[PDB]
Each structure stands twice: as structure tokens, then as C-alpha cells.
Paper text:
Milano is a contractile tail bacteriophage that infects the pathogenic plant bacterium Agrobacterium tumefaciens, an important tool that is widely used in genetic manipulations of plants. The contractile tail of Agrobacterium tumefaciens bacteriophage Milano is flexible and bent to varying degrees, which sets it apart from other contractile tail-like systems. A contractile sheath and rigid tube assembly is a widespread apparatus used by bacteriophages, tailocins, and the bacterial type VI secretion system to penetrate cell membranes. In this mechanism, contraction of an external sheath powers the motion of an inner tube through the membrane.
We have determined the structure of the distal part of the tail comprising the baseplate with associated receptor-binding proteins (RBPs) and two baseplate-proximal layers of the sheath-tube complex to ~3.2 Å resolution. Tail-sheath, tube, [name] (BCP), baseplate wedge (BW), and receptor-binding complex (tail-spike + short tail-fibers + garland) are arranged in C6 symmetry, while baseplate hub (BH) and [name] (BCS) have a C3 symmetry. The structure of the central spike complex of Milano, which consists of BH and BCS proteins, is similar to that of the central spike complex of R-type pyocin (PA0628–PA0616)17 and phage T4 ([name]–gp5)48. A similar Fe ion is likely present in the Milano BCS because the cryo-EM map of the Milano baseplate shows a spherical peak of 6.5 standard deviations above the mean between the side chains of His166 and His168 matching the expected location of a Fe ion. Similar to the T4 and R-type pyocin baseplate proteins, BW2 (T4 gp6, pyocin PA0618) and BW3 (T4 gp7, pyocin PA0619) form a (BW2)2–BW3 heterotrimer. The similarity of the Milano BCP organization to that of the pyocin (PA0626) suggests its central role in the function of the baseplate. In addition to the BW4 C-terminal domain mentioned above (residues 346–396), the Milano BCP protein contains an N-terminal Tube domain (residues 1–127) and a middle Helical domain (residues 141–345). Similar to the tail-sheath assembly, the Milano baseplate also features an extensive disulfide bond network. Considering that the BCP must leave the baseplate to allow the tube to move and sheath to contract and that the wedges of the Milano baseplate might be required to splay out to initiate sheath contraction, the baseplate disulfide bond network must be almost entirely disintegrated prior to sheath contraction. The Milano RBP complex contains no such fiber but includes at least four different types of proteins—TSP ([name]), STF ([name]), and garland (gp125 and gp127) that are connected to each other.
Numbering used by the authors:
A (entry chain h1): 150 to 395
B (entry chain G1): 298 to 395
C (entry chain v1), D (entry chain w1), E (entry chain x1), F (entry chain u1), G (entry chain z1), H (entry chain y1): 3 to 121
I (entry chain F1): 100 to 149
Amino acid sequence: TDGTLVTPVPGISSAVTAYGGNFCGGSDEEECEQFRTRYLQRLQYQPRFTVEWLKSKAAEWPCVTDVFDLGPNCCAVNALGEVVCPNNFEFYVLFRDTFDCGLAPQCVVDEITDWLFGSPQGLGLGEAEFGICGKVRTAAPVKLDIILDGLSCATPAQSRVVEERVTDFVNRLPPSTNLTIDQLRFIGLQVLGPSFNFNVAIRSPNDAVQPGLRFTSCGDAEIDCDYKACLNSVVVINNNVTTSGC
Amino acid sequence: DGLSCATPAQSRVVEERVTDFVNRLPPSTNLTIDQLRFIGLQVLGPSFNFNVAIRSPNDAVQPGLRFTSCGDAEIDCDYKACLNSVVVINNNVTTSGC
Amino acid sequence: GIFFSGGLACNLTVNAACGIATTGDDCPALYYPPKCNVQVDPLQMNAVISEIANAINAFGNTYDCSRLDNLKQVLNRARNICDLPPFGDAPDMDDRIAGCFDGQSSTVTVQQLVNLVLG
Amino acid sequence: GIFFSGGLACNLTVNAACGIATTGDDCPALYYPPKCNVQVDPLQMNAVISEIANAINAFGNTYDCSRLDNLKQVLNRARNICDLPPFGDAPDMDDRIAGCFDGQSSTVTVQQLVNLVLG
Amino acid sequence: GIFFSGGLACNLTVNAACGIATTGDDCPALYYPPKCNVQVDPLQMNAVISEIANAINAFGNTYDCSRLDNLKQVLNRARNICDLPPFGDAPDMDDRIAGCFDGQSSTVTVQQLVNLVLG
Amino acid sequence: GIFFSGGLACNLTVNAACGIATTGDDCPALYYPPKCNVQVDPLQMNAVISEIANAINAFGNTYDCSRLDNLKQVLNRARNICDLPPFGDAPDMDDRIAGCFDGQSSTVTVQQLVNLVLG
Amino acid sequence: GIFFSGGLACNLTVNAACGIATTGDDCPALYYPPKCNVQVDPLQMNAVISEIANAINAFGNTYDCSRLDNLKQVLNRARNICDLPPFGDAPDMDDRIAGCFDGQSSTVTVQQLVNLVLG
Amino acid sequence: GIFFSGGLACNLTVNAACGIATTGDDCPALYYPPKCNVQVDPLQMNAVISEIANAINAFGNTYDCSRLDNLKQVLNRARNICDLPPFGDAPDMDDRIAGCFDGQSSTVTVQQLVNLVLG
Amino acid sequence: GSALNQGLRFQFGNQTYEPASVVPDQLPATGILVLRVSAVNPGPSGNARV
């Protein structure tokens, strides 16, 4: 939000302010395998071409970092008990670099919908084709705390990389997806080996009840629609247990 | 339970990995459900639903086979888990179609 | 209780009846949502079956697992005033009698009865 | 309603009660099949929950979540004559009174009983 | 039907009840254990549906889909003695009348009430 | 403490008794999950062993190796009043005496006892 | 409970108390078999954790994880007399006083003490 | 016994309280060491189970695995003065009486009691 | 979040030590980094108790 002028100019105060407070756009050169898999995604036969087109276009908004589809916890059923196919085109967006958890307020995503579909939607007054309606959505955060037990016996490199991988996995988890214990254990087992003791635990801060969260018996963390898991902190309980035993 | 909806390539990969994992299983070693689930999480990714169950053929009892409370196929020793047939099925509805 | 822990309100679901009078906001009325990925909570089923068990044991009758008409039987016994046990002593003026008065099922004491008959 | 939409007839499965009276065939009685695995429908459980909860709130009572005998208490309220509120006015000759008559849960109006006492 | 075949006892689960009077010993008061992936058995639900349907069908009533308070109406008909049929012929002296005598619901013979009124 | 630091609550496992008053959040009530892969933490079994050992060493008694019932002896000597050492001094002033006064177990002073025998 | 579910009886292993008085076959006394392919069951360990926690909570005491002598302190408070609450109400005739009586830890009503003190 | 066969002393680990008095050099106070390739020895768990179960069966009570507070009830019965049964006969001059005495909880003989009250 | 480079050198007593493994690009979010480190000069002089 605040910055200084490098070169001094007479009569101009050195303190300048980032109008808006964010600096979008920065991206790196596209590699060869990424371009190959993007080009192969153009020739091949694609059902529901409209949804992928809209996602690729919406990814061009400033500071949009990730785009996700409607998660599995976001389906629905009629009274008879059959899945209903959605008639619109809806998905999420994640500004992982500007807001907290990447979740934006409702106004930003409303502006993105107005730019993408038009007003009123479906008239071809926007990027989307004629008769193409829908809506971009956001999610609300649910703070989850993650505790790793049994990691002190690993070499510092292993514990460090496991912490980093668990953090990066929870941060990139799409909205409307459960945070199962089995996923974290396999981020652990894939490093520590198949005969290492490792136990993870997912809790809520201060054991407070949060909207859009249910702890299944398993110990997982069911998260409902329009909500997203958010890493509060990763704590390691190194109760002095080591390999030597001193 | 729940592979039919994944593209046929992923289903074929998961089958040829599960059958090969169970073939090479050392004697006197449990075929836990966790070890099977984690073969689907690697190719299918964290956004898929994919459940795995182990059963005896025709629900018959066999010498030296028990099922743990978590569903693990606990094997008494001087025995070895040999695959009979891997079967795919779908009972939980989802929007993978449409 | 017999409601789902993380459910929805009556008007956000189907086969849901609202207007249920509950004691304290602590345990409100929430029903299973209409989403494919919902499995019936076994504990809620335990609460329901416990409620029907506590109800079926009323009037002293014991439950039978084989036959399935038992709640009908206890309900019939409820509307079976002929099954009400006879009184051992003699009633006085302060006792009560039930009857349909002006259309509503109410009660009246023996004293008002003798007052009306003596007129 | 509380039945399964895609279920089978009563005689084709187990634990099913036949002869259930319903308003037309548009409300058929179907139960889950013993064959191919089926998960109980959450919406049908919502119907069952709504039914039980509406039963609890009868007679002006409220639902409780701390204990699990509510329907037992409501059944005690039924068949308990004493509960019934008293009548404000005097019981007129036209009103009816309850009582077991020739082993039948019938009612007789005040006219006949005054005739008996006078006779 | 009810009391899930492979269930525990009261304190080995949650929301269960005790004192469940059961005919014989082969009908044990069991409840779903609270562990991971236990699934409600369809057949049990079939039995619960049968019980609820018999309860609603009692008193000669019929079940409806568009109403979620059928059990409430049947309970109200169990109460509200004004729903009982009138007595066809004249009553005799050995009949019984229901009422709250000394705080307990009981029946008294007509002979006693006539002895009372003549006094 | 004796609680597994990477643990759960009651409603997330079995054989866990919460309602455990602790002196702050730094010693929370946590238990082992209902999985078939977790291993019991030896540094917690040390806490349980220390607890029971300090329990046995109460009253100056010493732990012993051929008797699996040392805690039983400690409990007996805890309740059995007669093994309490004889008061090596003459009674005096208001040395309270225990008893089941009015139902609640308590003690009364000497003078409070002499007031009733004086009368 | 605190016994291992799939274990052997007392006389088929080591460090196993024999003659444990349970409350029926339902809770059999089984201990961990020797063998080798056996690990402490975490669900079993939860039971011991809970029992010790409840014991510590008894007598209104709270658990502290910084100290390892909690059960010892609750035992000492169990034996100690004037840890008991003082009594304010006047001792009626029919209260109790405990002590030694023919080498037995019993109590006697105030009647006997006053009657002996008459002499 | 309840200790680890090849463990360490108190200060060479954590959650290990020492000052434990044992009878002789055999089975001394050894606790699990802080090596993460060490698992709990099942036989030591059999010993701790034996100790808890024998602690339960004190006072002739029976252990129920369905409940998680048996030791709490045992400790309550230990401190409950009113638990002590009535003495079968009349007391005499040598019997002893409980209570605290100047903060020196002990027993008092009826002899000095009558000597002080007769004054 | 600070920046790190491969030119880290530590001064322990009178000796100099360098990273053995590859230094991470950024300091981890914990705020602490543990690094495998080897001496710069071979021989028995690099051994120390510090």
C-alpha cells in the first residue's frame, strides 16, 4: 500500500501510495510441456466446450490465480431422488495473492460476472456467446488447524519438506472439497517411507463451531458449498523423542 | 466403488496397478484398505470420490482370513493374498455425467 | 436429538415440517439437505429408534420384535377407556368426570352434576 | 411420503406391513429391497423426522433434546382422563359424558343419566 | 426388524435408551455402533416404516402423502373423547364411567354414582 | 498428561469419557482415534504408570512385585477407618467427629455433641 | 471396556489377575495374549485413560497435567477426615457416628452412645 | 510388573515420576525411553489392566465394561461415611471413634470420651 | 520470507563452514532453518565442540 520515490524530484513528496493496493499481471514464460498439453487440449474432442472456454477466459481477470469448478459437495437432487444437471455455467475463482486464502468479497466476483456474461446475462453484451448465461461465485473461509505428531524423528530436511507440502496442499484445496486425513497422510507417507510413525489431526481453533463445517466420525473435515478450507497454522509436537534417546 | 465416472484411461491404470499390487503382496501381510485407497489418490487426484472394499468371494469363509474393524483383510501367516477378480461398480450418484 | 446436526431449515428442504416447538435455540430443528453426498447419520437413527422404543413401552406393555403392529396396539389401548382400572373407594364431590361439553372434551366435578340434577 | 419412491411391494421384501390404507394408488406403499445395495434415502428420513416431531408437539407440548422419552410422555398425556381441562360453565342437559358401556368405549348424554337418577 | 441385528447396548453408543421391555431374549435392544462407515440397514428402515404406517392406519384412518402430521391427527383422535361413538340403546346399572378420582384416572360403576346423587 | 496430544473429543471416538475438568486449555481432553493404524504413545504410558505408582505409594505403603492388587490394598486402607492411628493425646476443645449427620456425611464439634447429652 | 476384546483368559497369559468379578459374560475379562504380532489397542487404552480421568475428577478435583501425583492426592483426600465438610445443622437423635467396633469399620447411631454415656 | 522390563530410570525420560518405593532390587522403577522405535509392551498393559480391575472389585463391587466411571464410584464409596454398615451390636468401653483431632486425624476411645463428657 | 543465496558462510570459533545441501530459495514460514553444513578446510582442524 505504501512506497517511496527512488529518484528525488523537487517539490514532490517521496511517499507515494499504491492506488488500489495490488499489482496484478506478473507471469512467467510458458514452458514446452505446458504448451504441449494446452495445444493437445485444443484439437481433441471436448464435450462441454463452453465451460472450459469460460474458465480459460475468466482466468484472464487481473489477480485471478486459480479457477475451479463446482465441488462435489455442491450437487443437488429433486424430490424423486435423481441428480439435476445445472442449466447455467458457474465456477469459483481464487485470488491467492491478494486476499486471505484467496477468497474475494462478493463485489469483486459480481464485477467479474458482469464483465464475463453481460447485463442482463445472455444477450451477447459480454465475452460469453449469445444465449450463454451463468455466474462466477466465491466462498467463505473455514479456519482449520493441522497438527503433525511423530515428525521429530525425521531429519530436518524431511520435516521441513513435509510441513511445506502440507501447507501448500491445504492452501490450494478448492472450495467445496473435504479435507480428509488420508490425503495428508499420503503427503506424509510419500516422503517418510511406508514404515514411519506419522499421525495428523485436523481441529478447529479453540474448538469453536464454524458455519459450513462438520467433523465426520472419521476425523475428516466435511466442508459445505461456498466454503473453503483455510490453514490457520501447522504445529509440530516434538516431545523430545529422538533416534538416540538422550 | 466409483471408478466408472473417471475417463477410461484412468480406470485402466487403476486396475492394472491394483492387480499388480495385490499379486506381489508378501505372504503373511495384511491387505489394508489404506494401501488400496492410496493407489487411486495418486492418479485420480484429491477432488475425486473413490471408495475401496475387500470381500471374500461369495461371502465365504476361508482358513486364515479375518476382517479387521477398519475393513483390513488380516491374514494369518503361512498364507498369501491372491487376487480373484477386481470389479468396478457405481452406487453413489454424481454429476460426472450430464 | 432426532434432528440432523448440520441440516437445513424446513423451507430449504423437502419432506420437512416446520413449526416444531423446541425448548431453547440450543437444539433447533434441522433436516437432511438435498445433496447427493449425504448419508443418514446413524446416531440420529439411534435417537429416532430410541424415541419409538420409549413410546412403545408405555402403558406397561412390552415390545415384540416378531410382530409389527405394536404402536397401533398401544394407540388402541389409549382409546380404550374400558381398559381404565376400576376405582376401589367411593367418589366424593371433589372428584372429576370427563365429557363432551358444548363440543369440547372437558371435565366437571360431581358437585356440579348433583347441582344440575337436583334442579 | 415416508415410503421409498423406487421401492418394491410389501410382500416382495422383509419387515414390511401389508394392508396399509392409503388415499389412492398415487401414494403407494413401497419398501427398500433386500437385493442390490441401496442407501436409505435422506429425504425419506426427513419425512419420518417430521412425522415424529409433529407427533411430539401435539397437545401443546414442546420438543426436548436433552432427554429421549418425549413421545412416551405424550402417550401418558393421552389415556389420562385427569389431564383434560375443567369446563367453565355448568354442564347442560344436551352435552355428552364418557364411560365404558357394555364393554364399549362409548358416550351417553346427560339426558339419559338424569332420566335414570330420576327414575 | 428394529433393533439393528449387529448392534451394541446402551452405553456403548450415543442417544440410545434402556429399559426396553422385549418379549423373549432373541429380540435384543441394539443400536448402531458409533464408528466410521457404519451404514443404516435398509431392512431396519422397512420395519420402522411398517410401525409408523400401522400407527397412522390405526383407528381406521388412512395415510396421505401431502400431510406430514398424520400421526398428530391420530393422536388427537385418541384424545378428544368427543370423537367416540354414542351409545345406541339405554345403559344399564353395571356400566363404568371414567373420571379423575383422587388424582388418578379410573372408572366407577353407575350404581355408585346413583348412590352418590341420591344422597 | 495422560491424554494423547494428537487426539480427539468424545463424539469423534469411542470409549472416551469427557466432562473432564482441566486447569486450562494446556491440558486438554484428547484420546486415540478409532483407526487401526495408530500406535499408543509410550510417553503417555509413562504418565499412566506414574499415576498408578504414585497412587500405590499413598499412605506410606510400598509397591510390591507379586501382588497385582496393590491398589486394592491402598483403597481398603483408605476406607477402613479403624486402621487410622490412635489419637496419641487426650481429647479437647472442638476436635470434630465424623458421621452421617442428616444424611450428608460431615463432622460435628465436641461441644456440639455435648449440648445434646447435657439435655 | 478396559479388557482386550480378542485376548485370552487370565491363566493363559502373564500378569493377568484371575477371578475378576465382572457383571456378566457381556463384559468378559480378557488380557493381551503373549504371541508377538500384537499391539496395544488404542480403543482399549482410551478406556484406561477415561477411568483414571474420572477417578481424578472425583471429589470435585480437577485434572492437572503438570503434576504426576493427582490420584495419590485424591486418595489422601479420601482418607483424610477433616477434609470432610463441617456440619452446621444441629445433630438430631437419629444421626450416625463412625469408628471402631469389635475391630470393624462401622458406624453406630447416637442412641447407643447416649445410652452408654448415661451410665 | 506395571513397569517396563528394560526401561530407564525416572530422570532419563519424560512423564516419569520417581521417588517410587519398591520392595527390593527386583522389578525396579523402569519407564519407556524416548526412542521412537519402541512400542508399548502388551504384558505390561495386562499388568495395568489387572491393577485397575482389582481396584474396581474392592468392597465386593463388580466391574461393568459398559460404564467408564467404576473407579470413581469406588472412590466415592471409599469416602462416603454413610456407606459403612450399621454395627450389629451395642458398643462398649474400649471401642474407638473417628474424627480429626487438632489436624491429626485419628481415633478416639469411648473411655476418654465419657471421661470428658461426665465432667 | 527473506531471500537466501548459496553464498552462506558461518564463522564458528576460528573456523569457517559452508552449506552441504542446497539452500532453499526462501526462509520457511516457521522462521527457523536447519542446514547440513561442512567445513571449508579438510583435516582435523575442522573438528570442534562449539
